Design a protein around this motif. Structure first.
Motif, PDB file in Angstrom:
ATOM      1  N   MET A 186       9.497   1.115 -26.651  1.00  0.00           N
ATOM      2  CA  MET A 186       9.133   0.540 -25.438  1.00  0.00           C
ATOM      3  C   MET A 186       7.424   0.065 -25.683  1.00  0.00           C
ATOM      4  O   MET A 186       7.067  -0.807 -27.061  1.00  0.00           O
ATOM      5  N   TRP A 187       6.733  -0.090 -25.171  1.00  0.00           N
ATOM      6  CA  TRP A 187       4.862  -1.183 -24.976  1.00  0.00           C
ATOM      7  C   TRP A 187       4.019   0.749 -25.301  1.00  0.00           C
ATOM      8  O   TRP A 187       3.714   0.617 -26.476  1.00  0.00           O
ATOM      9  N   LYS A 188       3.799   1.295 -24.387  1.00  0.00           N
ATOM     10  CA  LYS A 188       2.521   2.461 -24.084  1.00  0.00           C
ATOM     11  C   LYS A 188       3.406   3.670 -23.690  1.00  0.00           C
ATOM     12  O   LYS A 188       2.580   5.032 -23.660  1.00  0.00           O
ATOM     13  N   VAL A 189       4.040   3.626 -22.951  1.00  0.00           N
ATOM     14  CA  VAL A 189       5.078   4.948 -22.258  1.00  0.00           C
ATOM     15  C   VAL A 189       5.591   6.685 -23.769  1.00  0.00           C
ATOM     16  O   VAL A 189       4.635   6.993 -23.234  1.00  0.00           O
ATOM     17  N   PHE A 206       2.563   7.017 -22.799  1.00  0.00           N
ATOM     18  CA  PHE A 206       1.865   6.950 -21.530  1.00  0.00           C
ATOM     19  C   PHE A 206       3.049   8.428 -20.316  1.00  0.00           C
ATOM     20  O   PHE A 206       1.783   8.110 -19.825  1.00  0.00           O
ATOM     21  N   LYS A 207       3.647   7.975 -20.324  1.00  0.00           N
ATOM     22  CA  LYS A 207       4.169   8.513 -19.434  1.00  0.00           C
ATOM     23  C   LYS A 207       4.224   9.750 -19.966  1.00  0.00           C
ATOM     24  O   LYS A 207       4.079  10.709 -19.144  1.00  0.00           O
ATOM     25  N   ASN A 224       0.266  10.520 -20.866  1.00  0.00           N
ATOM     26  CA  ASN A 224      -0.979  10.396 -21.321  1.00  0.00           C
ATOM     27  C   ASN A 224      -1.244   9.899 -19.957  1.00  0.00           C
ATOM     28  O   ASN A 224      -1.478  10.443 -19.161  1.00  0.00           O
ATOM     29  N   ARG A 225      -1.992   8.502 -19.901  1.00  0.00           N
ATOM     30  CA  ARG A 225      -2.060   7.618 -18.833  1.00  0.00           C
ATOM     31  C   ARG A 225      -0.851   8.093 -17.459  1.00  0.00           C
ATOM     32  O   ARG A 225      -0.053   7.232 -17.448  1.00  0.00           O
TER      33      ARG A 225
END
Lengths: 11, 25
Positions: A1-4, A7-8, A10-11
């Protein structure tokens, strides 16, 4: 993935 | 993930990292 990776949760 | 990961900056992530999150807490 990228950031998940954190991110999923955290963000 | 397109609900929290990225979709968060879409909704109200402005404070969803400070207060708008503890809402869920």
């Amino acid at each position: 993935m990228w950031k998940v990776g954190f991110f999923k949760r955290n963000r | 993930k397109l609900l929290i990961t990225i979709h968060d900056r879409k909704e109200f992530a402005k404070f969803e990292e400070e207060r708008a999150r503890a809402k869920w807490d």
